[PDB]
């Protein structure tokens, strides 16, 4: 069954082994699906990132195809570019754009973002989501760990390992997929859901950018889930810090009823996003500049 799955992946990946053109693999990070390494392109000295995912260690292997579908089909300015995929032993390797500024997580855990920076991040994320959603793709893992930065403060959406597609023939998804504290209540309720779940998850990320962490982050994941499902929309710990404009924006995101929650395309017109600064405004938040 593992051997069966290897053979199958082999038919859809690029042939060969990128070890032949890459040097100095250095681990920089982990996920539940696998690790991330940087590597040097031998011929040129350029840097790339390489995601390595062991086929035997997945919750659900079939999700590994998401990596290949998104690469083949759904590219954009605010989406991490995937270059090639290979089967190397028992691992799927994906060679992709290196986002040398790291993940938004390191920022929200160590500094305070102002609203211009928050708005720039939301704007960038929402542009990527408007396009993904309009083509049937739901990310399902929106949180600060999935948002990556360039050295000059450009924002890109990453980690498509958990995504799903919808369409006329399959309008909703039913799988329990995401990270507990960021999951939409309808998803936790096991209701059929759509792209709207990404919008709730973004709201929780806005909570991360204002508070440093999502709500109920001290509760075990299952208790946190229960509270998300049953209670009113979670509140910012320091609501007193945010402008009325940020709060009105957040109120369009953290809406329990998915039918009433704003869409990505709606949100792109919200006056909060008029505060968005340029990428340069994000630059000082990064570890190498703080």
């Amino acid at each position: 069954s593992h051997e069966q799955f290897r053979a199958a992946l082999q038919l859809v990946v690029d042939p060969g082994d990128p070890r032949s053109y890459l040097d100095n693999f250095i681990k920089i990070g982990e996920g539940s699906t696998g690790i991330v390494c940087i590597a040097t392109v031998r011929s040129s000295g350029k840097l790339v990132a390489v995601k390595k995912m062991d086929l035997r260690k997945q919750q659900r292997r079939e999700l590994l195809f998401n990596e290949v579908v998104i690469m083949r089909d759904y590219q954009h300015e605010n989406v991490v570019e995937m270059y090639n995929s290979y089967l190397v032993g028992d691992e799927l390797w994906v060679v992709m754009e290196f986002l040398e500024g790291g993940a938004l997580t390191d920022i929200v855990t160590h500094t305070r973002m102002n609203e211009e920076q928050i708005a720039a991040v939301c704007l960038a994320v929402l542009q990527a989501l408007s396009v993904l959603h309009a083509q049937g793709v739901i990310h399902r893992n929106i949180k600060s760990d999935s948002i990556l930065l360039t050295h000059d403060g450009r924002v890109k959406l990453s980690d498509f390992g958990f995504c799903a597609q919808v369409s006329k023939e399959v309008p909703r998804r039913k799988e329990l997929v995401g990270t507990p504290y960021w999951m939409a209540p309808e998803l936790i309720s096991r209701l059929p859901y759509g792209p709207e779940v990404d919008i709730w998850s973004l709201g929780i990320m806005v909570i991360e950018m204002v508070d440093g962490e999502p709500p109920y982050f001290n509760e075990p994941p299952l208790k946190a889930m229960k509270m998300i499902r049953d209670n009113l929309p979670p509140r910012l710990k320091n609501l007193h810090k945010v402008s009325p404009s940020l709060k009105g924006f957040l109120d369009r995101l953290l809406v329990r009823d998915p039918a009433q929650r704003a869409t990505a395309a709606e949100l792109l017109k919200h006056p909060f996003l008029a505060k968005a600064g340029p990428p340069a405004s994000i630059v000082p938040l990064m570890r190498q500049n703080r």
């Binding site: 539940s32 919750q59 999700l63 893992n141 997929v177 995401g178 990270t179 507990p180 075990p220 994941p221």
Partner: peptide, 9 residues
């Protein structure tokens, strides 16, 4: 608690 790990099915 404080888990950043994902859940599938």
């Amino acid at each position: 608690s404080r888990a950043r790990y994902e859940m599938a099915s």
